Design a protein around this ligand. Sequence first.
Ligand SMILES: CCC(=O)Nc1cc(Cl)c(Oc2ccc(O)c(-c3ccc(NC(N)=O)cc3)c2)c(Cl)c1
Ligand SMILES: CCC(=O)Nc1cc(Cl)c(Oc2ccc(O)c(-c3ccc(NC(N)=O)cc3)c2)c(Cl)c1
Lengths: 296, 297
Amino acid sequence: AEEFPVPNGFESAYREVDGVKLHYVKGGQGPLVMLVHGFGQTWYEWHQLMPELAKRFTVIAPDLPGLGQSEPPKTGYSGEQVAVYLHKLARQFSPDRPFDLVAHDIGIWNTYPMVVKNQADIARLVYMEAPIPDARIYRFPAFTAQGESLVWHFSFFAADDRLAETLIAGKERFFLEHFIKSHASNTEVFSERLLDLYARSYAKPHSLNASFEYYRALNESVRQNAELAKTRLQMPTMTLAGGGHGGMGTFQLEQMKAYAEDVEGHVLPGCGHWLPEECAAPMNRLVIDFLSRGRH
Amino acid sequence: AEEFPVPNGFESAYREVDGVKLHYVKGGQGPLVMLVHGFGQTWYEWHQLMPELAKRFTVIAPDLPGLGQSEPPKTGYSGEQVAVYLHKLARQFSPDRPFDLVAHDIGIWNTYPMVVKNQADIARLVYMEAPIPDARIYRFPAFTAQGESLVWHFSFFAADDRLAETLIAGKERFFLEHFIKSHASNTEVFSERLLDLYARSYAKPHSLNASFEYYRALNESVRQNAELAKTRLQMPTMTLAGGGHGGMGTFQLEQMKAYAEDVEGHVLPGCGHWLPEECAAPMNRLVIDFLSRGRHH
Ligand SMILES: CCC(=O)Nc1cc(Cl)c(Oc2ccc(O)c(-c3ccc(NC(N)=O)cc3)c2)c(Cl)c1
Ligand SMILES: CCC(=O)Nc1cc(Cl)c(Oc2ccc(O)c(-c3ccc(NC(N)=O)cc3)c2)c(Cl)c1
């Protein structure tokens, strides 16, 4: 069974990595690019970008541990722990050559440690729409002069007593529509049909719980990254961020400059957090062009 | 049926104010003191202070509009709108002399504008455990190195789509326990019975909604307060804050110094946000002494 429609010419498969069965969708030929989704979503956010990339690359899009059709991690949900699964997965398909990485939202949290610890394995890097976990996150406001802030949910999701699961169970579809639209500029792309697909996936009890465990591990990931960040990333990197409602704006690039020697950033006007869906045409173009500067 | 037990010598009653039927509990003799509760609670949070205060004052503790047994406001939930109801209520009982005001939590939001606009009517002022709504609240962090912050609910409650009502309905008792205890140092004071009573009250559908409408009007209250604050408060003022887990610490006094010419403050070590229940004896003492420095029975 498949929670989301696989693009024509792609395969949906699973790979056991350190005792954890990871789901992925794969297609294309050439050097490997791994695309890693974020919260509220699955590999499917990449489905419009994938066929295009697959003309020039071998493309893999896994589900994060516990999310989509992937088993929960057995170690834990901190960025360093999860990154091990993603690194080993990628290296199964690219054992003797470096691969490209594109990551959105908590996909960043879950890949940053494997990038910094295995720099020679990463040819080119694209990060969009989430802070790398560090002390900067403790500066984001709980509340703004415009109303609900960007990251108040960090505390909601991290709260003890399974507060978030207890409140959200049974109302996953309602909550996700609010969460996604509140972080979007172009809300119109989130049709009821699309929201139904995403909500059905994260409503699996283990997936709802897994989603929040990433936030419950956030302070641990910050602590991990404080050590790792002592060495800057050396490979070509690009950041994207939305400039519209719900987007990270100039923060994405400004933070990355502290982490990378070689970085170019773009802020996409009229787009919020959900770049692949809100602004598919310019986002896809930026990613393809950036990755195509290397071998393909 | 009363939602909460009335202390001996007090009466539970109602007054219409601007077309809104307000509930209050009243007792004592002497100059008036009005005690205004906050979120998650009702007049009942004052039930331990009331009998002691009633020895020297006439004491009134209303339910905020939409909460407890009070009807919703007919105008709106912004601080300036809600304060009108509280001001006019107090004036019905103290038309000829100024009265004292004690407010906790969002009681502060709902009283500040009437205090600054009718300074002649306010003899002495006590504020505890809540910021006056102003730009300072936009600085509180969403998330901390220790985890769940104390202020993330500002956004949760202010959110549209009836986000909070929709998620909390059916789980009111569970949510309230988490909210109260996560802002407490002394969680033991919140018995199953006490939480049951508070949960049942705020779970009334118009009350659950009222609770969050206070937050949906918070930015408007901030905008209102920006203009009102051009005039400093001149009455004797005391701030109280908890110094333990969940408390506001030095913020209460430090914010108030920007608003008030004549202010003294205390931070209570070992106490969190819910001062009247977590730290009833010293809070009661400080309030009683501060108010008793003025004319009383
Ligand atoms: C330097 C001063 C400063 O900090 N300004 C400032 C204020 C706010 Cl309120 C703010 O909030 C935002 C804005 C856009 C976002 O996409 C997000 C955002 C990003 C990622 C996730 N993903 C996840 N899984 O929760 C969720 C939300 C948050 C930012 Cl970035 C900066
Ligand atoms: C060290 C420098 C500094 O400025 N620290 C600092 C940080 C924060 Cl985050 C902060 O805000 C707080 C702290 C504790 C609280 O219980 C609350 C609080 C207050 C009122 C309600 N009530 C309602 N109904 O929502 C609920 C919670 C707010 C203050 Cl005042 C100071």
